[PDB]
Enzyme design. Structure first.
Site, PDB file in Angstrom:
ATOM      1  N   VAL A  55       0.849  -1.185   0.000  1.00  0.00           N
ATOM      2  CA  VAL A  55       0.000   0.000   0.000  1.00  0.00           C
ATOM      3  C   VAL A  55       0.889   1.240   0.000  1.00  0.00           C
ATOM      4  O   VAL A  55       1.829   1.328   0.796  1.00  0.00           O
ATOM      5  CB  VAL A  55      -0.935   0.003   1.233  1.00  0.00           C
ATOM      6  N   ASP A 144       5.987  -8.968   5.642  1.00  0.00           N
ATOM      7  CA  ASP A 144       6.135  -7.585   5.207  1.00  0.00           C
ATOM      8  C   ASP A 144       6.788  -7.517   3.830  1.00  0.00           C
ATOM      9  O   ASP A 144       7.660  -8.323   3.493  1.00  0.00           O
ATOM     10  CB  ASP A 144       7.006  -6.790   6.193  1.00  0.00           C
ATOM     11  N   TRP A 168      17.752  -7.692  16.119  1.00  0.00           N
ATOM     12  CA  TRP A 168      18.397  -6.766  17.056  1.00  0.00           C
ATOM     13  C   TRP A 168      18.374  -7.240  18.512  1.00  0.00           C
ATOM     14  O   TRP A 168      19.198  -6.770  19.309  1.00  0.00           O
ATOM     15  CB  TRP A 168      17.742  -5.381  16.965  1.00  0.00           C
ATOM     16  N   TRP A 169      17.510  -8.201  18.859  1.00  0.00           N
ATOM     17  CA  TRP A 169      17.220  -8.564  20.253  1.00  0.00           C
ATOM     18  C   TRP A 169      17.465 -10.030  20.612  1.00  0.00           C
ATOM     19  O   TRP A 169      17.122 -10.443  21.737  1.00  0.00           O
ATOM     20  CB  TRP A 169      15.759  -8.212  20.555  1.00  0.00           C
ATOM     21  N   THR A 178      11.312  -4.644  24.029  1.00  0.00           N
ATOM     22  CA  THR A 178      10.336  -3.570  23.832  1.00  0.00           C
ATOM     23  C   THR A 178       8.887  -4.072  23.763  1.00  0.00           C
ATOM     24  O   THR A 178       8.122  -3.667  22.885  1.00  0.00           O
ATOM     25  CB  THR A 178      10.692  -2.762  22.561  1.00  0.00           C
ATOM     26  N   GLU A 236       2.865  -5.834  16.368  1.00  0.00           N
ATOM     27  CA  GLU A 236       3.971  -6.645  16.863  1.00  0.00           C
ATOM     28  C   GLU A 236       3.891  -6.827  18.381  1.00  0.00           C
ATOM     29  O   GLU A 236       4.290  -7.876  18.904  1.00  0.00           O
ATOM     30  CB  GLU A 236       5.308  -6.010  16.453  1.00  0.00           C
TER      31      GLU A 236
END
Length: 278
Positions: A55, A144, A168-169, A178, A236
């Site tokens: 989109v 995605d 990253w985690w 997060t 998420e």
């Protein structure tokens, strides 16, 4: 039938996490025997699905690179259907597909806020599972569009419910994850709880389990909207609450969704898919 020992050897990657306390494998390069699984699934005659949303004004570019790379690398040897959800069929490019691949395209009505666009994917995926995907495929992935396949992404990734470790985690302490931390949100997770930080850019499973993932996430998004709150990381955050309560039966290593801006440490042996710049 198939047992874990037939295709997975965690001792081949001793320096990383390869098994969970609920008996699920974490699939890393070196641990899996793709030839054993290709034979197993070919005898079963499976088909695999892949949904992707595109989109906005400049998506056509991301969709071309996503689909070109998926055709080259996703589930080669097995039939695949690509399900493409777009807001204007103008921005759907012509990509030539290979043997046993085909596609279906659907027009969606775009939302105003980039946050609800991302979140309303959960409602639309479930609608299409009931209307047709449940009858067309044995396993489904949801991805995605702003990423690119780099090497074989095959049947070693299939399972009842499949989650992705965020690049990253994956070595971080859970108190640094997060997660959503407000008790007022349906996505709340307290400090000192949690197994992993999962990435919403890739998730999958059978059509039955993907329907349950997407509808429970959508219910939590709605409940939060009605209490005028929006979770820190939108869908998420809800996905991470879902997989804490309903543990995934398979996890993919960060080799399957890598961000090169981190670098390339020793743990990352062969990259199957990489982030685009966001």
């Amino acid at each position: 039938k198939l047992k874990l020992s037939d295709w997975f050897n965690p001792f081949k990657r001793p320096e990383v996490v390869t098994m969970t306390k609920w008996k699920a494998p974490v699939v890393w390069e070196g641990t899996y025997n793709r030839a054993v699984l290709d034979n197993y699934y070919a005898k079963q005659k499976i088909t695999v699905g892949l949904t992707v949303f595109a989109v906005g004004r400049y998506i056509e570019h991301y969709l071309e690179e996503f689909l070109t790379s998926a055709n080259k690398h996703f589930m080669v040897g097995h039939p695949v259907i690509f399900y493409i959800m777009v807001d204007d069929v103008s921005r759907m490019p012509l990509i030539e597909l290979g043997p046993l691949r085909s596609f279906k395209v659907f027009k969606i009505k775009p939302e105003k806020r980039w946050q609800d666009i991302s979140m309303m994917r959960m409602k639309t995926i479930g609608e299409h599972i009931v209307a047709h995907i449940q009858h067309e495929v044995d396993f489904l992935f949801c991805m995605d569009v702003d990423q690119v396949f780099q090497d074989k992404f095959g049947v070693e990734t299939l399972g009842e419910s499949v989650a992705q470790l965020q690049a990253w985690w994956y070595k971080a302490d859970p108190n640094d994850f997060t997660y959503e931390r407000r008790k007022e949100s349906a996505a709340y997770i307290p400090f000192g709880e949690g197994d992993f930080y999962y990435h919403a850019a890739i998730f999958g499973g059978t059509p039955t389990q993907v329907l349950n993932i997407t509808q429970e996430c959508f219910k939590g998004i709605l409940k939060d909207k009605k209490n005028d709150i929006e979770a820190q990381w939108h869908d998420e955050s809800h996905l991470n609450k879902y997989f804490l309560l309903n543990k995934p039966t398979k996890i993919l290593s960060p080799e399957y969704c890598w961000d090169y801006h981190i670098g390339l440490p020793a743990d990352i042996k062969l990259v199957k898919m990489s982030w685009q710049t966001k």
